[PDB]
Structures are given as structure tokens and as C-alpha cells.
Amino acid sequence: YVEFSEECMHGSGENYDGKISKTMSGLECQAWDSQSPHAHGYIPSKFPNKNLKKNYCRNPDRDLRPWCFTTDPNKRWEYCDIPRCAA
Amino acid sequence: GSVEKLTADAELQRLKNERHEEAELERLKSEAADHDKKEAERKALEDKLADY
């Protein structure tokens, strides 16, 4: 997370709930319950057990890896690279 | 819908298809800006590469 941190994740980030609201490309993540120009069909009211809070990057569809929407007119959404377990 | 999470799995599955049609549409969107890049020599092959 920081300059010096070797945290261990499960593997696919599918069950990970970190306080990450930014992308690797400096792009800010859009808020889940906030209706931004970028329309989203992932309504938290239909996913209260997915911990859809604030604007943190999560894996709501059980995808290959977590992803989040972006408040950038050129990038609707992007994937998030999180350290995977090699043990 | 608002207070119930009934049939969430099905809605979620459909949303996945929506993201697929959207993210892949974005490819075409970018290609709209410059078609030369899109269909002619290198960029397509490079940008796409391989995911799955």
C-alpha cells in the first residue's frame, strides 16, 4: 500500500475490501451511490452484501480482479492491480 | 430493487454483459476518432494483444 508494505492478499481480490479509491493511472474512482455522468447499473440497493461503500475499488461481480468506475470523461472504468498470493 | 436484493445474481450477470458490451464499445469509440489506427497497420494488434 505505502512505500514500505508487503501485505499478503488471498489471490483474486474478489473477497478483498481495501480503502483504495484511486487507480494505478492516477485516476480518481467514482462513488458507488453517487450518480455521476458515467451511468452505472450496479445499484448498491441490489448489492448490500457486497460492501459497496464510498468510492473504494472492489470486486462486485466476482471478476478476474477488482475494478472501479472513474470520474474521468475518457475512462468509464478500469481494473485494479493488487498483489496476489504466491504461497 | 431498493430495499430487497432478490434476484441479484441474475441482475448482476446481466450487468456483466452490459459492461462487456460497453467496454468493448469503447474500443470502437476510440477507433471512431482515428480509423487509420483502428483498421490499417499496427495499433489494433498492439492495443488488443491478449487478455484471455
Return the number of CB contacts < 8 Å for A and B. Answer: 29
Domain count, chain A: 1
Query: Which of A66, A47, A81, A77 has the alpha carbon at shortest distance from B8?
Result: A47
Q: Do B1 and A47 make contact, defined as CB atoms within 8 angstroms?
A: no
**Which candidate from A45, A48, A61 shows the least CB-CB separation from B15?**
A61
Give me the residue label for grid cell 483504495: A20
CB A56, CB A21: distance < 8 Å:
yes
Dist CA A32 CA B21 (whole Å): 20
Residue A68 distance to chain B (closest CA, Å): 12
Indicate the domain borders of chain B. 8-48
Instruction: Find chain B residues with C-beta within 8 A of A61's C-beta.
Output: 12, 15-16, 19
Identify whether the C-beta of residue A66 lies closer than 8 Å to the C-beta of residue A24.
no
CATH number at residue A71: 2.40.20.10
Range of the domain at A69: 1-87
- Are A31 and B4 a contacting pair, CB within 8 Å? no
Give A84's contacts (C-beta < 8 A, 6+ positions apart).
Answer: A9, A11, A12, A13
* A29 exposure class (CB count in 10 Å sphere: 0-12, 13-18, 19+): buried
